[PDB]
Amino acid sequence: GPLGSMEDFVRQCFNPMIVELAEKAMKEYGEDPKIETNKFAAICTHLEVCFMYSDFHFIDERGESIIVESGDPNALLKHRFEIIEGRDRIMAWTVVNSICNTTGVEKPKFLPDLYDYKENRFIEIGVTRREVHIYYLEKANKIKSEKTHIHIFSFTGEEMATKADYTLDEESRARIKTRLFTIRQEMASRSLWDSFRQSE
Ligand SMILES: O=c1[nH]c2cc(-c3ccc(F)cc3)ccc2cc1O
Ligand SMILES: [Mn+2]
Ligand SMILES: [Mn+2]
């Protein structure tokens, strides 16, 4: 039917915290969310995936990996992931250096998205409107010598991850995929999707 505004969609369908972090990210790099609107939506989408990836995952009081969906994360539990994406450059490198100097893991060349304290590795999260294998390769090309694990989601439910190691259980990955499908369906109802797919 009528064509919506991608700005309206972003502000309506993403949490304000996410929108704000994305606006700040874009300003930091000199890009205007009112102009690069498809990019704004992609940035919000990727941030949300990063948050959803780490949601509910802890390392227990005996120090192994568990899921707690209660809003009461009893205080002896360690969050399983450190989130790097969404931080400004200075803070992001501060966090990365701290992890590296601590855990002994090697320092990445570019900022990754997450650190996994269970698997003891950085993770790069991809979100793509294209074939996952193509985007996997591109990401890998920048990471090169790689201790950094890559995990790619598409909007159609396909995934590709380093060494066929998917890190998370099926239910967690299913939440992310359901959210991506919902984003695509909603863009489509506002006639925003075609343009957004093509602009990656
Ligand atoms: O980890 C990722 N980070 C990204 C960051 C951007 C980005 C591009 C321009 C900006 F002004 C701000 C952010 C665009 C795309 C990505 C894709 C990623 O996987
Ligand atoms: Mn990133
Ligand atoms: Mn990423």
Report how this structure was experimentally obtained: X-ray
Pocket test for ligand 1, best of 43, 124, 129 (most atoms within 8 A of CB): 43
Alpha carbon distance 173, 189 (integer Å): 25
Strand 149-154 vs strand 121-128: parallel, antiparallel, or unpaired?
parallel
Strand 78-79 vs strand 65-67: parallel, antiparallel, or unpaired?
unpaired
Resolution value in angstroms: 1.8
CB 54 within 8 A of CB 79: yes
Report the b/e string of 64-84 with b at 16+ CB within 10 A: ebeeeeeeeeeeeeeebbbbb
Pocket test for ligand 1, best of 18, 46, 129, 153 (most atoms within 8 A of CB): 46
- Sheet containing 81-83, strands listed edge to edge, beginning at the edge strand earlier in sequence: 81-83, 114-116, 121-128, 149-154, 159-161
Alpha carbon distance 158, 180 (integer Å): 11
Residue 156's alpha-carbon distances to 90, 103, 160, 181, in angstroms, are 35, 36, 12, 7
Q: Is-catalytic flag, 139?
A: yes
Alpha carbon distance 112, 121 (integer Å): 10
**DSSP labels for the chain?**
-----HHHHHHHHS-HHHHHHHHHHHHHTT--TTTSHHHHHHHHHHHHHHHHHHTTEEE-TTS-EEE--SS---TTPEESEEE-TTS-HHHHHHHHHHHHHHH-PPPPSS--SEEETTTTEEEEEEEESS-HHHHHHHHHHHH-S--SEEEEEETTS-EEEGGG---S-HHHHHHHHHHHHHHHHHHHHTT-HHHHHHT-
CB 33 within 8 A of CB 22: yes
